[PDB]
Assembly symmetry: D3
Homo-oligomer: 297 residues x 6
């Protein structure tokens, strides 16, 4: 009785997951009328089923958010037993606190619960406490282990983990612990805090948006005598001049995951993308059958 659907955000990721678990993406239409309104029409009875919806609320965030919500509404109204959401990328998660502004990450939670979600599955939220913005169950998969493993495997010499900013220090520590390495941060107010001479430095953030912060960081590192420089993040937002900026940066290589569907029209040069499909696929099953999900950490 398990049905999985993919909306428009990251279909390639969604089929990969579906194949790993072993089902066919649901028969559903997420269409559009002449104006600009979405017309969801579920092409099959899901009465009493456990439906999983896969969707990253990546660019354009508002459109993806709305179709997600409308789908939920369609499912709820159509008598699904559970409506479970799998969000590889939680858009608006940076707007998690306040001088005279909204807290969109919270508004979203509230919208999703209103719409009718039963539970949520997420990957590396910008702030781990966003988890508390919900009152329905939510499982938080972490993504650092994946990158750690790819780096661990690289066998680089005297490496140092670097936090591009003041909020990254925790994440940097998590990765520093894996590779058993020291940490240093970019005190950009721009300055380096910590020994980093002749070292292989790895820059890491949760999201690489405009690639502004990070490229500037990599160059400063080099400018301060670092053997070579790598950069990784979970969510490849790469908006604006991001690609051009990186292709021109000193970054030996950029490591990212497929939580967000890559821009088809512009390619990073030195680059590697790891998949998170295996991880989410495993969580679906484990949640669907009620097996320890904590077992994956």
């Amino acid at each position: 009785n398990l049905k999985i659907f993919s909306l428009n955000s990251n279909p390639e990721l969604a089929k990969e997951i579906a194949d790993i678990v072993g089902v066919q993406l649901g028969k559903c239409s997420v269409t559009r009328f002449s104006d600009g309104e979405v017309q969801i029409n579920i092409e099959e009875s899901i009465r009493g089923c456990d439906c999983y919806i896969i969707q990253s609320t990546s660019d354009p965030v508002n459109e993806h958010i709305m179709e997600l919500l409308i789908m939920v509404d369609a499912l709820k109204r159509a008598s699904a037993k559970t409506i479970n959401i799998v969000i590889p990328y939680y858009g608006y998660a940076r707007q998690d606190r306040k001088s005279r502004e909204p807290i969109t990450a919270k508004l979203f939670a509230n919208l999703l619960e209103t719409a009718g979600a039963t539970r949520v599955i997420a990957l590396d939220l910008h702030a781990p406490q966003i988890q508390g913005f919900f009152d329905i169950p939510i499982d938080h998969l972490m993504g650092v282990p994946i990158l750690g493993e790819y780096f661990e495997g690289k066998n680089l010499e005297d490496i140092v983990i670097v936090s591009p900013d003041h909020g990254g220090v925790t994440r940097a520590r998590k990765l520093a612990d894996r590779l058993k390495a020291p940490i240093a941060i970019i005190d950009k107010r721009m300055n380096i805090v910590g020994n980093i001479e002749g070292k292989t430095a790895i820059l890491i953030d949760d999201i690489i948006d405009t690639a502004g912060t990070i490229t500037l960081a990599a160059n400063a590192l080099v400018e301060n005598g670092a053997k070579e420089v790598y950069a990784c993040c979970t969510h490849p937002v790469l908006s604006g001049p991001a690609v051009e900026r990186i292709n021109n940066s000193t970054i030996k290589e950029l490591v990212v995951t497929n939580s967000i569907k890559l821009p088809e029209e512009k390619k990073i040069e030195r680059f590697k993308q790891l998949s998170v499909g295996p991880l989410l696929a495993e969580a679906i099953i484990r949640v669907h059958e009620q097996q320890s999900v904590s077992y994956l950490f």
Copy 2:
């Protein structure tokens, strides 16, 4: 009062600017940008603590983007301690998805989203279905727009006119206008056929919304094909998506009358055309609502 702060999001600023000027107030200062990211950014550069904020926004194309900024705004205001957050919606997008099989009822989902976000009340103009009004549990005032069009045509001084309902759902609206003008009604039983006398008459086609202009142009031509003196068309909401304009410019429609509830496509112009403003009405509605003077008086 000085607690009447009014904001305009991106849907129809010209209309907003107008309703604010008419009222006699400066549009609240508010950063309503989008990050390059596409996510919506909001700064409200003016303490609104304890104020009564009115937000003006049509959820017209693109509906999902406008809906989201509206919601985010509300959230900003609620979190920033506004006293009341009142929504003025000249055009309620998704009002066509008002029932089901296995389909959603987006007009209802929206209501639910808006109340969740934190709205205090709503002001609307000609909803596709008057019962959408009941999808809310917060107060909502529903302004009719027919009177405005009625009046334009009345001063046109036409003779031998018949009001026409393009479809099976328009009959009520057609009646409202037929009354206001003391004219008979006829409908297009498109299954396509005319039901009622219309020979040599000046026919006025009326719908709440003119979207693709498909339904209506085809209607006008059929009228002509059935010997009607001349043909006019009106609606409140000018959605005009797709080939709408081209289709009308080529239609037999002597003239198309619409309101400025939805911001007109800047890049394509109807030829024989007239747009009436609904700013005076909403401005009036806001005032009455704000000071608690009867508004039923409009309706």
Copy 3:
């Protein structure tokens, strides 16, 4: 684990349904104390069962509404697994919009959900959008097909479907499509709009309340040269002088359903009542077992 109960509105309809599906109406007392308060006392354990309640909120609407709500409350408090409501006739559905008035159809929805309903099954609501006044699942059975079939079977000549008023046009179309006939409406402000000379006209509304609107319509038709006249509606409210007015009308025959229990003390003369028990009975099962309910349209 399926239990069905009948309150006081339309017990004959309720037993018919119960027999079709195959169970015994629940052991429950819907009594009254000396004053005028209802005393519900469920004569059997329904702990963990799926309870279906059958009730039309017909005259007197307020009494029927209250017992329904009290029953729900009794069931909820007694640990039913699901409390599902089957409403053959949704009273107050005409009060679905606003000059300075309530929207009772919405207040009701809200009351029913507060009381504890799990879902609703309805037949021909005055306004299809009332369906959206709820946030719990609701299935809307339509009743026109039934009447269409009885008319289709009649083999009448050059028939025309007539909408007694400006709101009936949609319904009229639905029936016009069945019998493959043309439509005409009564533009009562009173006038006929459309060809209807020498035709067999069928008047149709969702409800025939005081029978005012409709009788006056039938006579006007005749007065405008119509071969003969029939009239149908789903819900036979027939309040006031309704019967007398029809018995005196020109209506060759009046077709109605048993959604509302007929006045025992006054009989229409030329008349036919079709049952909706088979339809609802089928919906119960299909909902209870989770089979496509959309399959019935």
Copy 4:
């Protein structure tokens, strides 16, 4: 203020008219008819936008009809943008169904219905159970009615009196009156027996409600049968259903004292009887509540 609009539904208009006159206000104008259909119709012919509306209604026989109109009224008002919708319930029907097996707790369901409909607050008089007060989450002020009856009897100047509790639940209420009159108490341990000295005494029977008058008449007669000087009976809520009147007119009760919280049956009259008004109290309660002057001062 002029924002104190008061409405009366059908339960007890004489009482309502009185509380309005006392306060000094004209009862809000409101069509509160029923369609022939039996469904309840409502028009509120007077903009109440932004006003503070008080609704007066006992949910007495028929309880379900009165409950429904009350709810529909509230809905009308909420949808029509009243500022506050405050309910004044002289008699809270269903207060006897206050706990369970497989039975409902209607007093609670009601609270939940009233809040759902949209009430802002409630004012009540002698609930069958004081803890019903906790079934709400909106503010509720509970007026006691014993003081009123206490005072009538006090000025009667009787001697050698004993307060009697008709049953096991009345003992508290009996105490309240025994105190207010400095008298002893005795109860009817009906399982039927007297518990306490009562010989040659003037006994006063008191219950919150006198419904079928079954319990109480039988009590009075037993008292007499046990040598009591004379017997009086009082209660706040005169439900008097069934054979109540006949039973009392035939009882040994020298006199029955009640309040006008429930509208008296027009077609049958008690013989030896006295009705005290609770209008002055509620009127007072409304005023204090409305201007926010302490009301605990009553209680």
Copy 5:
């Protein structure tokens, strides 16, 4: 799939129950940090299970209330299927009505539902209508039968049941009906109402807190010529000088239940404690398997 947990209130009672039903108290830590905050850490996957929590909100009420709530939250967030609460002693139940005060018994209900409870099982609430403060199902076990049986068994002569105060009369009647005895009350404003000369009197209240009310009652009885005096209550709160006062009273014997864990440091002399474990144990099962719970009255 049934798991039972015990928090800190009455663990002895909790194990007794667990043994009767047949399971092991859950693997969970209800710890404390240096400051004073509780750290709940559920030592095992309960995903999809039906969890029963046993806890009396006895002294200290606020601490016990908070751990209960935190546990619920932990369970809800951890995906329990149902979170069912067994409360042998409902603290704050005397604060059930209002001159300018809170109604804590109601605030509590609201807190418990917010936290995430599915249902409640309680024993002798101070006010039976507290039952209505909830909107989730609640089963109310009564405790008088137990004491009745112990008294019935005692074979005492011409006994009279006594209500220490004006609110106890109902409870007194329930017990008077068991032993087929008459009732009398203490009209303390202090006076006796009813014949009680040379009789064996049994004083009964739901709770014996400071033992003030009751000891003073017993002595008055004696002072009015009563053959001998016994006293019973369900909930042994015994705060303050309670024990000393009773040990010095004329009470031949005090009968109580183990709904509240007895003060380890001070012992009543003439005393008997009956267990309520068998009763609750039976309710767990019957609720868990959905069998008539009403069957136990």
Copy 6:
């Protein structure tokens, strides 16, 4: 206005008394006792019907007792018809339990409890996590406390200073202070190691909370061990549980700076120490909030 009623529960009365005196108001009269039973008793001896009540309470040790009385108070006030029930929390207990496995998120449960009880809004000071702010849906103003400490140190006129983050989460806070003082930052990468130049410097250790004083003392000593001119330490919330005091009195900390958000242990005194008051700030916050004057101006 005279509708600014302020109450103090048991957490930090000296602070409360101060914020009330500063504002210029008499602390609302309210019995806030506990029965011998241990259950909390509440009488509010002063009609507050229609008033705007502010409650001051840190949910410091014992957290559960303070939380419960706060909730019960709110309940009392809500049931007693207060107009607004506004909470001032100098110290938000449980802010450390802000995420998960199989653990609760008590900071969130609390928010949910407070809103259920009936709060209208919240005023807080330096939450452990700024996003806790989003756990609420009622308005909440978050006051930063760094400015206060910044200023003390600024007037100390030190030279060659470095701000130090005891741990991986403090880096932001350290930056805020480094900025306000134009100093560099260094952190303790305790996995224990120093990251950044700190030789011969005057180091200031800063955390939001100093609980067991474990983390920080060990940090100060390591600094010294790495050749730092001298060492100071500051935090907003002085939890000082366990061996905290003893550990600091023995540490190398030249001086410890804290605020009075949490009431100091009466039985044990730090030696080299300075406590700054946050009363002026909250007092100011209350006023701005109450009259609806911008408060962002603080932050």
